[PDB]
Design a protein around this ligand. Structure first.
Ligand SMILES: [Mg+2]
Ligand SMILES: [Mg+2]
Ligand SMILES: [Mg+2]
Ligand SMILES: [Mg+2]
Ligand SMILES: [Mg+2]
Ligand SMILES: [Mg+2]
Ligand SMILES: [Mg+2]
Ligand SMILES: [Mg+2]
Lengths: 61, 157, 208, 169, 294
RNA sequence: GUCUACGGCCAUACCACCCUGAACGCGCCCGAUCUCGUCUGAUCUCGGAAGCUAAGCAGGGUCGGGCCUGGUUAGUACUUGGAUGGGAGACCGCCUGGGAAUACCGGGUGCUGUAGGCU
RNA sequence: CUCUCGCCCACGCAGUUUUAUCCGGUAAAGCGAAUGAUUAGAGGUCUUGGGGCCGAAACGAUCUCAACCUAUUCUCAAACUUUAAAUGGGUAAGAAGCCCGGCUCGCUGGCGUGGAGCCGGGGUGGAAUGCGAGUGCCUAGUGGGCCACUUUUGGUAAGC
RNA sequence: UUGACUGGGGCGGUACACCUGUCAAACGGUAACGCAGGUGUCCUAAGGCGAGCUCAGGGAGGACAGAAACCUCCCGUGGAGCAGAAGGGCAAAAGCUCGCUUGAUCUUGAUUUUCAGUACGAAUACAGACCGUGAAAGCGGGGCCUCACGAUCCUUCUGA
RNA sequence: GCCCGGAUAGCUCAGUCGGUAGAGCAGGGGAUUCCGUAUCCCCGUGUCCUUGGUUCGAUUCCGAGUCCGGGCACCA
């Protein structure tokens, strides 16, 4: 009752039977695990450019 | 069976090459990495803290995070039947700037300055590159002398 | 001791006597030069080799039987101290023995199969020399006949070649004497110390 | 004719090497302070060999380095008991020398049976002005071959000052 | 016949650096002094290179770029006789006066003159400049002594407080100025200001009048050169303090004055050193041909 | 033409030895009253300027040693892919492409940034 | 199911090459380069290990085997290596790009510095070949394999 | 109720959880009761930080003192040491000596390793605290890196 | 014929602390005695199994062979 231990035989042609895929790297990646002091700044910079911007830029635009 | 331990098959690759030991030079630390920079991974052996893993040594990824002493790199890694984008935190001594895009960033420079260089002059420069063509019908010269006759030499031990 | 049919063709990676083997008996050859070893360079001009045709393993024991056979013919012809035989290839590969029944099924089957150190062979490549004498040029047909008897104690196929070099040196014997004459070679015993012309200049002044 | 390339007593280093620690070594430092007037520093063994009675981190000897005019003040005491004659092989290949005495009572020390007899090793190193760049912290450098001193040069120093006899055989 | 130290030692020898063999740097301390955090990306990290030598003290402000260090401003002590201290250019008071010259030259270059005065009269106490709200921020900087031992009273900390009194923000502690008690924990500012105006070296001139006048001609001979006397000296540095605060700009000489060039040998050519060999080989063979036969 | 302070690349820069070194400097050098540190003012810290290029240091030299670079070794050794090729085998040749390494011989021997000084 | 092709240039993709860029320590090679094995002679002699020798005696005198050192020489290494292939692995070959101006920030801080984000604006022809792609749910069987080149481990060998 | 693996089973051994070099065929992965060994600990310093220093070995000198005692000078690219198995790494050092200390503490996420891309263990990069040390830059949340360990239920102690 | 310990005087035997060659018998000479027996003393007798390694040091430690005694030993 001794058997066969480990092969990678037949595994290369079934990896390609559905064809190994790049995960397509879309625009706008997530900010999952950016360092927190940088991220905590960057949403303070996103909640004041929506308020205190669009009178002194709409003239310049 | 086969010892699934970190830093396993690295007798030669986490080793300083030959006669380049000692404390590491300082322009390595004076390298500036921004987001989206394309860096290539090469774990050294003197600095012990932020070596990635032997899975990534030799590979090339993109910066998404910049820290005080390290850089967050997304690399593609081959697991069995699919690849995955893995984000690995590597200290700054184990990476460097990859020149792999810098032959494309030269010919977006010398392409756009040459695109408008013919727009002002009205030609058809065809700035798209072709691979090595078959050779031109040239005309060799054998001036004066004669083509030297060579013959296969005999056998000796 | 098994037949050398069993321990022949280079099937394993080389298994030298080192700090991992630590059990291997000593080879039968322990001396390697048997002629007049004290002889100078210019005494024996020509050498003669025996060269392999095939990539096989010659045992350490079979190199002993050939040097006794080649010494015996040439003390019979060239006299004691009229030649210099050098057995050139050294046994470092250690062949192994899986000594079973150690008429019964008692010990194991193939369970702990990795052998015990049995003996030493030498891994010989195609074209590599095995033995080589050097003699006077008046001994030329005793070069072949010593090296034609000593190939009946080796497995496989060997070939006898009288070399174009000056003895056991690396230099061709046509322009050896043209080159040892003025400066470029100096004799130190049985070999030749080629001197360049690019050192410090006081050891050019030590010459002349 | 030779300006400021000249020999001088760089330091003088003395020791007694007692076979053991304890009472016998505590008053060996009483004597080497009686010569020099400065406290000895206890040297201890790093080898445990057990045929000597010696032992690791066991204080085995006393020594000091005396420098300056008090170096040559002790040295003129030890040469007039060795009668200003040395042997030629007391001179090292780096030039510096030393001779050693037995019975420190022959030196200016008065005998006291509570202390006993100890032997010294006087060892003299010679120096030129400029030898200190080998021991400087900031820009440490080698000394240069013509500026170091030899065995053959220090023996004609000993005949110049202290006018001694080399006595080779 | 004895031993062989180097035969393939050289084949496997790894030199340290150009600057470690020469003994200037260490690169263990440099690596911590000179590199910015990577998330700051371009902001220079400034330093204060204070190097005392024989007969001079050099104070520089550099920062680290990949093609070499970039020095902003530099103050010396052979510069110092232009302001009033003509002699004794390596004491603790020429160290302080170089540092205040190094500080005032920087803020004048940056335009931060009128704000950030620092401390005009020297009490010697630990002052620590603060950045004013609405004004351009203070120049933060980090002292590096380099390879000199930093105990108390080391005059590399003399230039440290000359810089602090000029309006430079340097992190430090009073624990290594002269006047800090080692077995206690107190600090004496009165000892430190006496050490800063040069009455430690005025008392030793008073110690060499009334003890041995003959050693006072050997040492302090170039205070007897012009006239420097131990009552005049404490006022004499205060005038140097008040004159480097009102003129730090360091004009440069017109400096042309020469067209002269040759002082050392050039590297001789390949053919000149190749024909030198055969000119030696010919000169040896005549010594054996003619001078062993006749 | 070079240097000093700080550097980058880290031997074409190191190593052994021998010559030369104006002027600034760097340094050896002369002292312990203070600051400080020693068994010892030798080192380390502090006061200088009476002497010195002797050394370090800088240039240059050596049919130098290494180091760097190039030939030769050599289309050699290996190797991709192929054959109902050879041979009892071990191994081998050819096809289609890629292609080293040592001895041996040749040539080089620091290059530069910032700031300040001499000529 | 989501879409793309129906009538001067693919969105997208790839068990492929090319063009640039790195990564590695296999084969080979090396050991007159380190580590570890290892044969031979040559030259110089501090030295001890012993003899021939003037000799009551004498590092006063004449020598050898060694030993050590120097320059050489033969032969090696899956658990050695300076060097080092072929085959191979990652990445890049554009509008999700390039550039300009402006606004936000509590982060950074000599500095209207640094860096992120945000808004508005300007110009698309950017290796070869081939192919229509994207995505979700549900899901059975299988989880004893065997063989042949080539490369390999144990074994004398095996249809092992 | 009477383990499993197993060149049938038993006896033997543990290849049953794990780490190092090799096999392994130059990214990674890769089997056998393949080879050479190792682990179930040790450490209030052998953790932390700063300073000063240089190692193994050899040569030549020094009273006893000799192959090995201590003293000095010179050479010394790691031939030493780093708690222990190996491999990697390290010289104004990661080694030796000394001075202070407790970051071997509190807290939330992310990432890596094995991997199904689950967990444990180990680890990396942070962040918010409170601290140590150093003149400062800084470094530090255990040991120079690769191992040194353990669910549910139950119990015990601590926390508002 | 697989492994475990041995190899020492004319013999047996201990050890050969990494630094000697030692009990005890056989032999030879003495001493003792009236003469003997026992007894006592002494002198001999070591390729320390060969070869290679490991330090002013190996028979002693390591390990290669040979020589010798003692044995790992299933169920079918
Ligand atoms: Mg004192
Ligand atoms: Mg004191
Ligand atoms: Mg002094
Ligand atoms: Mg000089
Ligand atoms: Mg000179
Ligand atoms: Mg030179
Ligand atoms: Mg050369
Ligand atoms: Mg092929």
């Amino acid at each position: 009752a001794k058997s066969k231990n480990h092969t990678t035989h037949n595994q290369s042609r079934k990896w390609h039977r559905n064809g190994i895929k790049k995960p397509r790297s879309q625009r706008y990646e997530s900010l999952k695990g950016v360092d927190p002091k940088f991220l905590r700044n960057m949403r303070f910079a996103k909640k004041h450019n929506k308020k205190g911007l669009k009178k002194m830029q709409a003239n310049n635009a | 069976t086969n010892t699934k331990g970190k830093r396993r098959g690295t007798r030669y690759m986490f080793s300083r090459p030959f006669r380049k030991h000692g404390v590491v030079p300082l322009a390595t630390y004076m390298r500036i990495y921004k987001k989206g920079d394309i860096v290539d991974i090469k774990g050294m052996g003197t600095v012990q803290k932020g070596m990635p893993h032997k899975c990534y040594h030799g590979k090339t990824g993109r910066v998404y995070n910049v820290t005080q002493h390290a850089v967050g790199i997304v690399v593609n890694k081959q697991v069995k039947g699919k690849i995955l984008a893995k984000r690995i935190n590597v200290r700054i001594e184990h990476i460097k700037h990859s020149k792999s895009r810098d032959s494309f960033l030269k010919r977006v420079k010398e392409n756009d300055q040459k695109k408008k260089e013919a727009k002002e002059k009205g030609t058809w420069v065809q700035l798209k590159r072709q691979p090595a063509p078959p050779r031109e019908a040239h005309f060799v010269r054998t001036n004066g002398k004669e083509p030297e006759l060579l013959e296969p030499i005999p056998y000796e031990f | 001791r098994r037949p050398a049919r069993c321990y022949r063709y280079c099937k394993n990676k080389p298994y030298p006597k080192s700090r991992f083997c630590r059990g291997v008996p000593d080879a039968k050859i322990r001396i390697f030069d048997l002629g007049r070893k004290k002889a100078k360079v210019d005494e024996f001009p020509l050498c003669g080799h025996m060269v392999s045709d095939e990539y096989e393993q010659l045992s350490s024991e079979a190199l002993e039987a050939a040097r006794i056979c080649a010494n015996k013919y040439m003390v019979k012809s060239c006299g004691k101290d009229g030649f210099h035989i050098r057995v050139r290839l050294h046994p470092f590969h250690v062949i192994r023995i899986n000594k079973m029944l150690s008429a019964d099924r008692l010990q194991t089957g193939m369970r702990g199969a990795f052998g015990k150190p049995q003996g030493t062979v030498a891994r010989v490549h195609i074209g590599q020399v095995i033995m080589s004498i050097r003699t006077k040029l008046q001994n030329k047909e005793h070069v072949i006949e010593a090296l034609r008897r000593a190939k009946f104690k080796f497995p496989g196929r060997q070939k006898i070649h009288i070399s174009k070099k000056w003895g056991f040196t690396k230099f061709n014997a046509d322009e050896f004497e043209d080159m040892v004459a003025e400066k470029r070679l100096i004799p130190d015993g049985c070999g030749v110390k080629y001197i360049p012309n690019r050192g410090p200049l006081d050891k050019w002044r030590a010459l002349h | 004719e030779n300006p400021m390339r000249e020999l001088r007593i760089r330091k003088l280093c003395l020791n007694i090497c007692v076979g053991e620690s304890g009472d016998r070594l505590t008053r060996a430092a009483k004597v080497l302070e009686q010569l020099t007037g400065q406290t000895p520093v206890f040297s201890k063994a790093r080898y445990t060999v057990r045929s000597f009675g010696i032992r690791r981190n066991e204080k085995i000897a006393v020594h000091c380095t005396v420098r300056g005019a008090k170096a040559e003040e002790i040295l003129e005491k030890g040469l007039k008991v060795r009668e200003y004659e040395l042997r030629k092989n007391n001179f090292s290949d780096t030039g510096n020398f030393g001779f050693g005495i037995q019975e420190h009572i022959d030196l200016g020390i008065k005998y006291d049976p509570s202390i006993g007899i100890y032997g010294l090793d006087f060892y003299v190193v010679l120096g030129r002005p400029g030898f200190s760049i080998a021991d400087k912290k900031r820009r440490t450098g080698c000394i240069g071959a013509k500026h170091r001193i030899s065995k053959e040069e220090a023996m004609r120093w000993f005949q110049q000052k202290y006018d001694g006899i080399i006595l080779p055989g | 016949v004895k031993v062989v130290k180097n035969k393939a030692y050289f084949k496997r020898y790894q030199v340290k650096f150009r600057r470690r063999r020469e003994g200037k740097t260490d690169y263990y301390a440099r690596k911590r002094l000179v590199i910015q955090d990577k998330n700051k990306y371009n902001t220079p990290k400034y330093r204060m290179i204070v190097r005392v030598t024989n007969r001079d003290i050099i104070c520089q402000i550099a920062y680290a770029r990949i093609e070499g260090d970039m020095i902003v401003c530099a103050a010396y002590a052979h510069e110092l006789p232009k302001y009033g201290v003509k002699v004794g250019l390596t004491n603790y008071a020429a160290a302080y006066c170089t540092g205040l010259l190094l500080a005032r030259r920087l803020l004048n270059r940056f335009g931060m003159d009128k704000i950030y005065e620092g401390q005009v009269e020297v009490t010697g106490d630990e002052y620590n400049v603060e950045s004013i709200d609405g004004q351009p921020g203070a120049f933060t900087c980090y002292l590096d002594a380099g390879l000199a031992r930093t105990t108390t009273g080391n005059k590399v900390f003399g230039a440290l407080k000359g810089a602090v009194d000029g309006g430079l923000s340097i992190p430090h502690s009073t624990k290594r100025f002269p006047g800090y008690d080692s077995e206690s924990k107190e600090f004496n500012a009165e000892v430190h200001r006496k050490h800063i105006m040069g009455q430690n070296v005025a008392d030793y001139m008073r110690y060499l009048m009334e003890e041995d006048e003959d050693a006072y001609k050997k040492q302090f001979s170039q205070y007897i050169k012009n006239s420097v006397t131990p009552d005049m000296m404490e006022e004499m540095y205060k005038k140097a303090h008040a004159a480097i605060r009102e003129n730090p700009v360091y004009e440069k000489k017109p400096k042309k004055e020469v067209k002269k060039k040759r002082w050392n040998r050039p590297k001789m050519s390949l053919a000149q050193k190749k024909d030198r060999v055969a000119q030696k080989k010919a000169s040896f063979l005549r010594a054996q041909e003619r001078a062993a036969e006749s």
